[PDB]
């Protein structure tokens, strides 16, 4: 039986994308650029803050100094950080609390493997910290977004190999990173997005302990 | 108040997209071409049967005669048609049957505005024919994505202007078609996909007569 579950945060435990979006939208309006809507925002997902800022600026062909560019990027983060003060337990995705409980009951290790620089904060705000055996620190891994490194780190940090673990991810880069680590991916979303070769569920309510076991047995 | 509701079929009333995919995949295997998966399938949505085959031929730089091209296109459609023989009333999406009943009870016209060449057949199999005042024939109109023609035809066939109507769609091109027709769109899906400028519900169980009336009043 698998010995640990390695969780990404956004798209699995809760929604942080919503707040990245509002933070960029707030910035954009604030310097009076139009066009930063939910469709536009797709061009910002999985993309660096600087490339994200550049794309926004290009909407208005706006010009900036190096100093203004620095200040805008910092201001986006300040916004994001204000907007996540809102996070609570009511923001936890369905099935997730109950999965963490049943994992903890069965002495399966639980680690976070997220790029979020606000991981620990977000977990405390959602009242989830007590379930987590480790949180991989993205600053100590410093790897690129499809790299296995964060998953390896999260596994190692709870004293297991990635081959003893399942990873949960809503993104194709994430799924690829779990695969590269050696762990077994189970996706959440649409097969059109993630691929036909892994177990995908439609929403997080399907991530149950019993489901996770059956998947493990059947690989 | 709006006087007609113009329905897309696939993604609104039921799923036919899955059958299209299975038949293309079955054909691709038969001719020994790999890479016909759900993700590649996204590139066949809203594409003619012939253009779809070509995109599949192009995965392996495969060539065929004009005669065999026609044969492959035919076999795929036949298999599709065999596969939809199983469509039933149980395959109607949540909320739709009740919405149809309520529209009819309130003497609001109901038309099909679908590209499906099997629309009448599909509504007979789902036992929906009774609710529909008209079905726009896609053989008699334009096959451009996001062309308003099918929506215009549907409205006209129930004796309304498009400006008197609501259109239900789950794809961006379909939303654009509704807009262009003059009708008011209500999307089903994600704003990331459909746009932020229209009302979108997350699934079809939100498509209620009360909801449609509220959208109409606020437009
Ligand atoms: Mg994610
Ligand atoms: Mg559709």
Locate the chain B residue with the closest alpha carbon to A40. B192
Q: Round to the nearest angstrom and report the end-to-end CA distance of chain B.
A: 11
> A17-30 and A66-83 helices cross at what angle (nearest 10)?
130
Report the topology of domain A4-14+92-218: Rossmann fold (3.40.50)
Question: What residues have CB less than 8 Å from A40, skipping those under 6 apart?
Answer: A59
Return the bridge partners of A168, or none. Answer: A7, A186
Report how far residue B115's alpha carbon sits from residue B1's, in angstroms, rounded to the nearest whole number.
27
Question: What residues have CB less than 8 Å from A215, skipping those under 6 apart?
Answer: A166, A184, A186, A199
Q: What is the largest CA-CA distance in chain B?
A: 56
Using CB atoms and an 8 Å cut-off, which of residues 20-59 of chain B contact chain A? 37-39, 41-42
Bridge-based pairing state of the strands B109-112 and B134-135: parallel
**Which of B91, B102, B123, B110 has its CA nearest to residue B3?**
B110
Which among A39, A191, A196 has CB closest to B192?
A: A39
Bridge-based pairing state of the strands B109-112 and A199-201: unpaired
- What is the H or E stretch that residue A184 is in? strand A184-188
Locate the chain A residue with the closest alpha carbon to B36. A196
Q: In terms of CATH architecture, what is B17-86?
A: Orthogonal Bundle (1.10)
Report how far residue B90's alpha carbon sits from residue B32's, in angstroms, rounded to the nearest whole number.
35
**Is residue B23 a contact partner of residue B74, using CB atoms and an 8 Å limit?**
no
- What is the H or E stretch that residue B156 is in? helix B149-157
Task: Name residue, tokens 């739709």.
Answer: B96
Report how far residue A73's alpha carbon sits from residue A76's, in angstroms, rounded to the nearest whole number.
5
Report how far residue A86's alpha carbon sits from residue A78's, in angstroms, rounded to the nearest whole number.
14
Q: Round to the nearest angstrom and report the end-to-end CA distance of chain A.
A: 11
Q: Cα A28 vs. chain centroid, distance in angstroms?
A: 24
Distance B11 CA to ligand 2 centre (A): 5
- What is the H or E stretch that residue B7 is in? strand B4-7
Residue numbers followed by a gap, chain B, C–N over 2.5 Å? none
Report how far residue A13's alpha carbon sits from residue A7's, in angstroms, rounded to the nearest whole number.
8
* Structure determined via: X-ray
**Is residue B49 a contact partner of residue B42, using CB atoms and an 8 Å limit?**
no
Residue A200: helix, strand or coil by DSSP?
Answer: strand
**Is residue A57 a contact partner of residue A68, using CB atoms and an 8 Å limit?**
no
DSSP code at position B95: T
User: b/e map of B84-116 (b: 16 or more CB within 10 Å)?
Assistant: beebeeeebbebbbebbeebeeeebbbbbbbbb
Radius of gyration (C-alpha) of chain A in whole angstroms: 18
Task: Name residue, tokens 């009448």.
Answer: B120
Report how far residue B168's alpha carbon sits from residue A178's, in angstroms, rounded to the nearest whole number.
38
B189 touches A: beta carbon within 8 Å: no
- What is the H or E stretch that residue A131 is in? none
Q: Cα A68 vs. chain centroid, distance in angstroms?
A: 29
**Is residue B10 a contact partner of residue B17, using CB atoms and an 8 Å limit?**
yes
CA B149-B153-B159 angle, to 5 degrees, is: 145
DSSP code at position A192: H
Report how far residue B199's alpha carbon sits from residue B190's, in angstroms, rounded to the nearest whole number.
10
- The beta-carbon contacts of A57-64 under 8 Å, at least 24 apart in sequence, are A57/A33, A59/A28, A59/A33, A59/A34, A59/A35, A60/A32, A60/A33, A60/A34, A60/A35, A62/A31, A62/A33
Residue B185: helix, strand or coil by DSSP?
Answer: strand
Bridge-based pairing state of the strands B165-169 and B184-188: parallel
Report how far residue B58's alpha carbon sits from residue B32's, in angstroms, rounded to the nearest whole number.
13
> B66-83 and B49-58 helices cross at what angle (nearest 10)?
110
**Is residue A16 a contact partner of residue A9, using CB atoms and an 8 Å limit?**
yes
B192 touches A: beta carbon within 8 Å: yes
**Is residue B94 a contact partner of residue B15, using CB atoms and an 8 Å limit?**
no
**Is residue A10 a contact partner of residue A17, using CB atoms and an 8 Å limit?**
yes
**Is residue A118 a contact partner of residue A14, using CB atoms and an 8 Å limit?**
no
Distance B174 CA to ligand 2 centre (A): 7
Residue B200: helix, strand or coil by DSSP?
Answer: strand
CATH 3.40.50.1000 positions along chain A are 4-14+92-218
CA B38-B42-B44 angle, to 5 degrees, is: 110
The residue length of chain B stands at: 219
- Characterise A2 by phi-psi region: left (phi > 0), alpha (psi -120 to 50), beta (else): beta
- What is the H or E stretch that residue A52 is in? helix A49-59
Q: Cα A147 vs. chain centroid, distance in angstroms?
A: 14
Copy the structure tokens of residue A49.
Answer: 């803050």
Return the bridge partners of B184, or none. Answer: B166
- Give me the residues near ligand 1 (ion), CB cutoff below 5 Å: A 8, 10-11, 170-171
Task: Name residue, tokens 């499809």.
Answer: A146
Report how far residue A17's alpha carbon sits from residue A122's, in angstroms, rounded to the nearest whole number.
13
CATH 1.10.150.240 positions along chain B are 17-86
Q: Could you write out the DSSP letters of every residue in B38-88?
A: HHHHGGGTT--HHHHHHHHHHTTT----HHHHHHHHHHHHHHHHHHGGG--
> B17-31 and B49-58 helices cross at what angle (nearest 10)?
40
CATH of domain B4-15+93-218: 3.40.50.1000
**Which of A160, A162, A170 has its CA nearest to residue A133?**
A160
- Characterise B116 by phi-psi region: left (phi > 0), alpha (psi -120 to 50), beta (else): beta
Q: Hey, CA dihedral for A148, A155, A104, A81, is it positive or negative?
A: negative
CB contact under 8 A, B196 and A42: no
Report how far residue B175's alpha carbon sits from residue B196's, in angstroms, rounded to the nearest whole number.
12
């Amino acid at each position: 039986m698998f010995k640990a579950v390695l969780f990404d945060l956004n798209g699995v435990i809760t929604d942080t994308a919503e707040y990245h979006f509002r933070a960029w939208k707030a910035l954009a309006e604030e310097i009076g650029i139009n066009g930063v809507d939910r469709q536009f925002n797709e061009q910002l997902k999985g993309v660096s803050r600087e490339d994200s800022l550049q794309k926004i600026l290009d909407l208005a062909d706006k010009k900036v100094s190096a100093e203004e560019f620095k200040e805008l990027a910092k201001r986006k983060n300040d916004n994001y950080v204000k907007m996540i003060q809102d996070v609570s337990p009511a923001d936890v995705y369905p099935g997730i609390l109950q999965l963490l409980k049943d994992l903890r009951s069965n002495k399966i290790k639980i680690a976070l493997a997220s790029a979020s620089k606000n991981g620990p904060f977000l977990l405390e705000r959602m009242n989830l910290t007590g379930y987590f055996d480790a949180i991989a620190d993205p600053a100590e891994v410093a790897a690129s977004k499809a790299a296995p490194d964060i998953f390896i780190a999260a596994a190692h940090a709870v004293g297991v190999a990635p081959s003893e673990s399942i990873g949960l991810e809503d993104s194709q880069a994430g799924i690829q990173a779990i695969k590269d680590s050696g762990a077994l991916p189970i996706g959440v979303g649409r097969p059109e997005d993630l691929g036909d070769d892994i177990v995908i569920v439609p929403d997080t309510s399907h991530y149950t302990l019993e489901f996770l076991k059956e998947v493990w047995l059947q690989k």
